[PDB]
Symmetry: none
């Protein structure tokens, strides 16, 4: 990737095998979860788009999500070339060409062009935009891979409350809902779809119950 | 994490993959125990708020504990903002603004802001404050995750005394309380739930004696 | 491979033992997956023909595939020698001789000659051409290694649509086709060889629908 | 710990997570062996007292040994405070204050104070004294862990001499005795509790013989 | 191994412990395979004769093969000394003496001698000659360790054709012979010991046909 | 240990935990073999005597060999202080004291004295002499650990020849015999203690048989 030396001038570095090996291993073990996105954002930090493309191509299995993220990249590139037209025809000497929809991903562009683009003054955050697009794609993927809806979460007659609320927060974290509606529903749907005795206990305790109080009361 | 080193201190390195991978593995194998608190304190010695956010987001499972930790951090940030109000009006040029209650959690701040706040003269230990917040959250988590109470610890007819006192001290360390009452409770509970042989041995020895003599008395 | 020292001259670094061991182990683990070609492409970034030959010869097993790729290498070298003439005479300083097919293959070349050919101005991409030939041979072998045909794979009565589309994309990646017509298969046959219920669902929704919405409709 | 950069000034480098991981793994697999104390001595080469505190706190289980070593640390700190008076007043530049037992332990001190104390002229070996106290506590713990006394081991009728002398030395490495008397012990108890036939063999050969010839004679 | 790099080339580094451990593991698990010669050629790329001796001394088991390798190396060194006699009389000042037959094996030489021999102008590649000796010895070892002869390889009624030709080519690579007979023996031995159906298929295809068509003919 | 920087000036470095863990694993898996002496010589190359002392003290089990190597170290130190008398009473300014029998091992000498001795001009190879003494001690240990004498090896009526000659060469390499007598007995004891039929077959070939002939003829 990209490393910073104590001198001040940075150079290009090839992709290390350890990072891609760890990525493949965590994809195999952790098939799909909300945690795969922060780990991907922290592992591919400061990397060329070719490195991210190779990481997305070396993963074995789950080709549906790969096609989904590829279509998302294509749509984002189309929107980019639609909203950013090429008004300047000629190119000034010493300046490189502007990254287009197919060049921002690295399909028809070599590594030297990406190096010259990211090392410009001022730099062009092509890698950052590509990482943001991949993060949006992974968000869409983990939203699609939700086992069930948040409304369909109902505690059974004998199922404990710990695993119930765990699955509730798990299926709520992967939902694409905003923070406001999530904070609004986490105070109502948690108590309305609980064990009847524990539900009545929590309702009689008061309308200002917190997490620890509910955990201590619902288990008694 | 931020690195203070020889000339060229203006550098920022992301979290190493090995560290976060080992953290995920140990929080997976060791789901929740008071051992994880010194581990987190050592793995995040002088780390950035974004690094701590990534470390808290990389752990998979146990969403209830994460929600409790988040709400404790929010409550403590609100308390800090209440006790440390922000000054109104224009800020002085060249003087960095004091970190707000929400800026400590890193939810509405950027990397350059915390970099300038940590490398200021004098430095502002916001990272240490957030680490203390996470430590308090983990304390509350390991206190609410206790399956058996400290009082219910009673040594059986065949359970060894060493394993009994080890379990007792582990349960005592799992709970957080003032040491001034801990000194009394350990003495009023250790010599009461032992085997009859060890009980009469410690009665013949003396209550005000040390612990090593009690360990070497009823051994074997 | 070839690396650049910090503020130094271009020097040649030896083969990576850890990378070679990782490759020889990942071969055994994933004996033949479609990702082995991107894996080799990422592990052989800027590698020398001698290192590539050693990495090919160090693999245990798959001797039939090794013989096939060697035959393809010989055919490519013969085609290169036929399309590019060979000249002889005195070797002037600063200019290298005309590389022959056996010189491109690296069987009758040496390390110093390879370094002189790859570090010339302009550089002769002998290693790049050899890597392209190797990945083309691997593509041929993985196309021959296709168990189920793209035109022979059909969704069963009890086979889930997720596994169906996964195997469909795997067979599409494993078969041979051009980039332009590649979309025609995944656009037509994917809906023409599916279950009748989801066929009617997609026909009622619209053929222009994307994979995400068509799968969310076929699941419901 | 403390390291010296090449042609640089003495700077304090952060702790290594792999060191703590190896430490916790070796204390988990090898719960309490005689060699774990040289292991700790080699892992804590030139480390700050905070590093040793974190390393001791990161250990999972065996809280009785932790309480015992904490009591020994408190006793050593009290003895140091009693033997070394404490003075107060203005702190002159270039000279540090009188370290107190609570400061030697590192429980009520910070990092910058320890750094200034260890990098002063002349250096105050606070970390060395703390490491000596910790290894003395570990010696006490490993002596308490010894199940069999030095005088309680005797060679059986069917037990070979190799395993006998191995267990004898393993028990001697965990007893409480000085080297001067340890020499006499390993000289006389080895022949006093041996096999009668090999006893007569060694008496005919001579007590001043080395262990090699004694073992070769007892085997034959 | 020798390190040819930027200014400061006068340096000799011992074999890395990780590479030696990997070699020990690949020798212990895979005692002898036709792919161990490329493994040795890659792990010992540009190494001093002392490093090669240390690698050959750390082998576990198979002492007869090591004795065969040693006697073959001695015979080849004697042949080299016979074909390259050493000049008598005083040596010229400043000119390094030519390596003798026994000096190549490193049995009567030191480290400084071989360092000066490999770093002379022009360099004397004695390490490459010793590596050739070692790989010839390994070829003799793997040819002697052949459990079943090449002629006795016959495909059963149920064994697949791909695995059959893989085993055939593996056994052919394990044996070292001239190139002008192998291409004839493979053609005169493969199309005779196949399945009756595959035999009729290849008889319907043609003897002078390629191998890929034979592989894709009787597949499945 | 001791590392060489690119600048030219070397500094002291603490013992890495990875090498110590590797040594412990080698000792645990392979208790004692004639091949571990080269492993120790290549792993502890250029290390301070304190590092070797810690490595010899961190080993778990087989304390007989540890006592043997300690006695050999003591005997070598006694011989050193006997053959090297201290004829110079006073010490010149700027010169360090001469290493005595107890100082050459590091019992009553700190690490700073060893660093000053090894970095002197000219350097005093204390570490090299200590490594040679440890190598001699390990040689004595592996000689004592020999299973039986070379004469006791006799091939049974049904025991194969491969394992027979393997054990023969193993106990020959583990034997303290010189190079001449080993080559003298390897031509006689191998043919005189074999299977009678294969013995007569090998004797009918002649007195100029090689190892490959002995292997290929005795198996027929």
């Amino acid at each position: 990737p990209i490393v910073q030396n104590i001198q001040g001038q940075m150079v290009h570095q090839a992709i290390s095998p350890r990072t891609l090996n760890a990525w493949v291993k965590v994809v195999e073990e952790k098939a799909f979860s909300p945690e795969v996105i922060p780990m991907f954002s922290a592992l591919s930090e400061g990397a060329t788009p070719q490195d991210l493309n190779t990481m997305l191509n070396t993963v074995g299995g789950h080709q549906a999500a790969m096609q989904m993220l590829k279509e998302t990249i294509n749509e984002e590139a189309a929107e980019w070339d639609r909203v950013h037209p090429v008004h300047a025809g000629p190119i000034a000497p010493g300046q490189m060409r502007e990254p287009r929809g197919s060049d921002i991903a690295g399909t028809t562009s070599t590594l030297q062009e990406q190096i010259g683009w990211m090392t410009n003054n001022p730099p062009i955050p092509v890698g950052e935009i590509y990482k943001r697009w991949i993060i949006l794609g992974l968000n869409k993927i983990v939203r699609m891979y939700s086992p069930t809806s948040i409304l369909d979460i109902r505690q059974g007659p004998k199922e404990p409350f710990r695993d119930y609320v765990d699955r509730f927060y798990k299926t709520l974290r992967a939902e694409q809902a905003s923070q406001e509606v999530k904070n609004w529903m986490t105070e109502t749907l948690l108590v309305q779809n609980a064990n009847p005795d524990c539900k009545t206990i929590l309702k009689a305790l008061g309308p200002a119950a917190t997490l620890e109080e509910m955990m201590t009361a619902c288990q008694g």
